[PDB]
From a paper:
Two different crystal forms of the OTC from M.penetrans have been refined. Despite the different space groups of the two crystal forms, in both cases an identical dodecameric quaternary structure was observed with an exact 23 point-group symmetry. As with all other known OTCs structures, the monomer consists of two domains of approximately similar size, the carbamoyl phosphate-binding domain (or polar domain, residues 1–150) and the ornithine-binding domain (or equatorial domain, residues 151–320). In all cases the dodecamer structure is formed by the interaction of four homotrimers disposed in a tetrahedral manner. The interface between homotrimers that constitute the dodecameric structure is mainly located at the four 3-fold symmetry axes at the vertices of the tetrahedron. In the M.penetrans OTC dodecamer, this interface forms an intermolecular network of hydrogen bonds between Asn42 and Asn43 from the three monomers, which is unique to the sequence of M.penetrans OTC. Thus, whereas the catalytic patch formed by residues His275, Cys276 and Leu277 does not vary its position between the apo- and the substrate-bound forms in the ornithine-binding domain, the loop between Trp237 and Phe247 displays a different conformation in the apo form of the M.penetrans OTC. Interestingly, this loop constitutes the main binding site for ornithine and is formed by the conserved DxxxSMG motif (between β8 and α10) in all OTC structures, except in our structure of M.penetrans OTC, in which methionine is substituted by leucine.
The arginine deiminase pathway (ADI) is the most widespread anaerobic route for arginine degradation in microorganisms and performs the conversion of arginine to ornithine, ammonia, and CO2, generating one mole of ATP per mole of arginine consumed. Here we have described the structure of the three enzymes that constitute the gene cluster in the ADI pathway in Mycoplasma penetrans (together with the specific membrane-associated arginine permease coded by arcD gene) and compared them to previous structures of the enzymes. In this regard, M. penetrans possesses and expresses the complete set of the ADI pathway genes at the same time while exhibiting a fermentative metabolism.
Residue numbers in the entry:
A (entry chain C), B (entry chain C), C (entry chain A), D (entry chain D): -1 to 342
The structure:
Amino acid sequence: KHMPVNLKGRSLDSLLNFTTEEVQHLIDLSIDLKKAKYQGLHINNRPLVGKNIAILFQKDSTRTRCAFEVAASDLGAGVTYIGPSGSNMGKKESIEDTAKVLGRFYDGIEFRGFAQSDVDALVKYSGVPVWNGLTDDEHPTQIIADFMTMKEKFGNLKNKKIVFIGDYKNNVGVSTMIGAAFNGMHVVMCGPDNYKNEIDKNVLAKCIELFKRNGGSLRFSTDKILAAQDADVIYTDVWVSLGEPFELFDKRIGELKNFQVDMNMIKAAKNDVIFLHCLPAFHDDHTSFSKEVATTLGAKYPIVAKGEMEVTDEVFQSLHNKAFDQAENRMHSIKAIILSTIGY
Amino acid sequence: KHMPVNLKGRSLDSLLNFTTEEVQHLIDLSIDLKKAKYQGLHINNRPLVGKNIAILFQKDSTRTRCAFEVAASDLGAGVTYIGPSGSNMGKKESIEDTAKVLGRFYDGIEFRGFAQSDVDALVKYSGVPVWNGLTDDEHPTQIIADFMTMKEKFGNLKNKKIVFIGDYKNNVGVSTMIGAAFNGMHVVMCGPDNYKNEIDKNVLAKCIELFKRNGGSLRFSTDKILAAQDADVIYTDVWVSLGEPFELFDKRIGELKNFQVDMNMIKAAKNDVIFLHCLPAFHDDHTSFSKEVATTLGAKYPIVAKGEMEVTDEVFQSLHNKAFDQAENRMHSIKAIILSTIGY
Amino acid sequence: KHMPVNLKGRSLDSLLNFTTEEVQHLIDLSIDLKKAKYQGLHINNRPLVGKNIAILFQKDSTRTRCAFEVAASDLGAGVTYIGPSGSNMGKKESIEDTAKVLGRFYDGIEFRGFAQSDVDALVKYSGVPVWNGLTDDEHPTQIIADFMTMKEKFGNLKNKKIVFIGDYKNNVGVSTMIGAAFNGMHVVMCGPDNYKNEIDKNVLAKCIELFKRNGGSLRFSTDKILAAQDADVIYTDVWVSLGEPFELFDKRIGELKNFQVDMNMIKAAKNDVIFLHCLPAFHDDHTSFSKEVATTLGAKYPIVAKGEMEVTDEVFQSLHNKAFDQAENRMHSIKAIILSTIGY
Amino acid sequence: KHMPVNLKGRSLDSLLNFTTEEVQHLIDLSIDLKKAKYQGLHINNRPLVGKNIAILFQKDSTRTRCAFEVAASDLGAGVTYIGPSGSNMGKKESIEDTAKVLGRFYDGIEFRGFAQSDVDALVKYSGVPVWNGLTDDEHPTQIIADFMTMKEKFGNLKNKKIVFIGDYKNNVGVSTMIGAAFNGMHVVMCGPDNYKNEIDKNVLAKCIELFKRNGGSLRFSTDKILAAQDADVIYTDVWVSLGEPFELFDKRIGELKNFQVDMNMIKAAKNDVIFLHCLPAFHDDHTSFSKEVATTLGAKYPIVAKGEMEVTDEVFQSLHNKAFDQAENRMHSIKAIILSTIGY
């Protein structure tokens, strides 16, 4: 705990492997690096000239990829991008052997893919810093971006209130809960009552320990307008998982229909409440997808009849939506992570 | 609104043409650039080498000129200073033709002069960034300096209270009201009741919209000790306009005599209240001008009998006067404006 | 027009949004940059270090992609290439939302895709320079590279004569007509008389305005040998669309069979005539696709029986063929565009 | 003529002290330097770091001053601007003593003033390069800019035709005659017959000899329409010099009234004629001076009724008007002169 906040050589496999001081360091550094770029300081100060990173994506994730690509370039590192065709592991070669080779060529490795265990193998066998760019269990680069954004707005985050509403058991929802614990905030996980029973219990146990240490609290709710009361932040995510069949679509939005973020919910929160969403969001009919949803389920569920789903265009176009600031911050935060971890 | 805060190529003709996010960006950048200079970072990092700006002054304004000259130089730009003899427009050549030529030689143009319309022509016909260095209608570089100063002192400015007292219908007074709207503060425009009827109504309408969006309020007052109550900032300006004849002098100070900032007013405000003034200020008899005023009107108006006018030396020498910090900040703010607008 | 030529911050969505002076400047700047690279001046002089661009391709376009890659790299910019997987706008996210994030990350964006309105959204919502890499409607980077190539060979182009022959209603043919208008050349659009009624009538009106202003003229023709009289340039394009079905395929070559560029045509033109083709071209049976054509057709259509379609190998091997200089100039012209548009 | 072209240490006192090759060299170097600024090559290549120049203006000439200021700064030199209050030679000190001191401080001297003999003394006693910024006798920097502009439009100028029309005996007229001799052009000095008698005879003799060598011709004329036949260039200047007494105005306009440049004249020339004017031009009523003139006269002289004098606004807005390119070129041409003369 009171050793130096030295992150050289560490991997961002899960944020839970880091102290509260280390997490605050990442967030602060991010803000510093953002401020530095606006001054053009990255023109003459490129500390990773001589370094190369590989960024693997076994499923495409363009936001995370672009953030890695601009952050590394700004720092002076070469980046090689390997998409799904080359990122599939454990099939043609053991992930162990792949790891040992990547560690010979590269100074750092990003990986986005399904199995957290894949990340663990990469970390163990490569010997260089590995950065989890999203797995089934966690989205740790996104955490630094999100809480950095809230901090830019409010300053110190302790005892501030955040509601994550919707499919709160998914990787984003769970990632947000971890961030709330590290920042001593009060979280309300607002959605279907039984979702909380699907959250990995080791994660809950660790968050609980963090809340006791840092402040804030964890609470589950079933009531959107209740949850909203006194909230500084309201954070939502998609109800749908592209690639699953009509049944599960129908099922999910059936469970979720009472939890769409609308002006009602915004109005219940504080005046300065900000809205967050990792994007993309479905908040109108300007997508071919919203359309073939407003059309084929606008019957049963009138709530999606205008394309809108997890949030309404009315909320999305208001001054409360900070999702684009939050989007930009994925770059500054990933830059902080790469710098701390590779070192200047 | 939620597009990127990209100011490249924009002109600072009026601050009203900018979003609230853009205005906060300018203020924050200013603070960043100030902090950077104190570290000597401008020695090796001069992003505008290869660029030149022209700074025109059809009436002399040494504070604005020096700020432009040091800010541009620090950035690495050449500057050419054209005073009143060469800055007069529309007489010897159409301002349109002058604009089209300046835009061929220079990467940016500053202009201080009477007609806002002159600024508009420069912006339209030159095609490069134009910076209004003060016109009859507005003093937008001063706005960034002033609110930067308040922010350095208090942090976030929303719902803080500022009183602008005196000739509150003049360009400084109106400029301060715009800044208050962008920062969600409560303004009291404290002076003669009828002055409010001379304020351009399109400006009021826009400020009103900003207050509704950002917070704070607009209120007119006739009572100095009332206005002061709970104020974080008290901002004043000169009662006189050098170059007008004795009549209007006499007239103005007759209308204004009840609104001089004294220890009474300071004491009514909060303990941490700061005093602001764009300078120069008449607050003692150490000017040949205060003297031939304390002498020829000290009779009728005993309030100016010691040279003092808009403020008393007692207030000016107290720890509340931040006008010299505010003065320094004209440079850092103009540097932020030039950098954002020309780009690194 | 009296305005300074300042392309800074501009998007290249359609050449038609530019003045004649701005088009010449791009052509001349490209020639300069080509000369500067041959002297190795790009090693020590790299004006875009600290900038990053995204190049998006919703259909693969290898030639355009490489040009951007080499151009941006020579300038010192980072580039991130996103292919079809990640470039499809409007399905999983509104193009507006995507555009607003792209602009947070990148300093400029290239986009190649079917709908010109996609380019329009990118320009409106990203806030950064956007470059049309080719849409159904127009190919603006190719235009600059084409007329650059012509200028390199002939000097000032006013009143010189160009024949675009074949499917002159397609995007290359239309683009070429636009380019000729900007250069005051005489164009003859040569092929099936019907094809002229398929050209956007707004594009026609604007070209006619440019011909009147700049010189040259517009004519249509049905006879390639009469069209070739006094021609400085003969420019053609493929007869087929890959992916397109047999019927349409067969229909086109029936319509175009009399419009193949052969030595007879070359000789009807001037002695210094040059031949252009944006490439790839089918001018022999060295492609598996030519063979498939000289077989499934070519009894029915003996022109395509040796694999040659729009042009014969005899012309393609002759000193008249400048298509490879035209190809190299994709890079120099795209460099002029990035440099002008981002700025040094 | 066989001597190397080497202008190092030379003064630009009169162009007539220069060979035809030296004048072409300066025009050509002007074009090269223009192309180089557009690619950003002046950021890293500043051959005059360590040099300082003084630019003296006995009467304010804003356009020439800005050209020197920007040209020198691009090259890396410091510049000291001295206005009328400081540039009055021969009154409080001998010009010879002043020149001796200026040579001790500076590496180059610009001087703008009425007496050519003041330039001669600066040249003789300072020992450094001296550049004539404009005297009663000549405007040598303007000559290089002007003929540069013609060359950029036409290429080789030999045997091409220019008309100088109006007060052709003034320093701009005579200067244009000089530049035309050096370029082998056919000049027609068009205006009041008795003007040709006002032109220095040595100058005429020297020009005659240049035409014989280079291939132009000199010719006077009283018919604006006849003179314009087959003209590639029409160049004019103002009829009035601010500020002589009124009597001289109406005397002048009485003499010049038939020589205003109008679209009838433009149309009598070649289609590609270009119009030039060193500016400011009075071509409408957007200047206070125009109005005062359209008022006091305009009864007596109908042409000047709309504010237009030497050129009509209809021509001035035509695509023929190049005066703004001509204005930009003041800078590049002055840059060629400074660089050639101080040396790299």
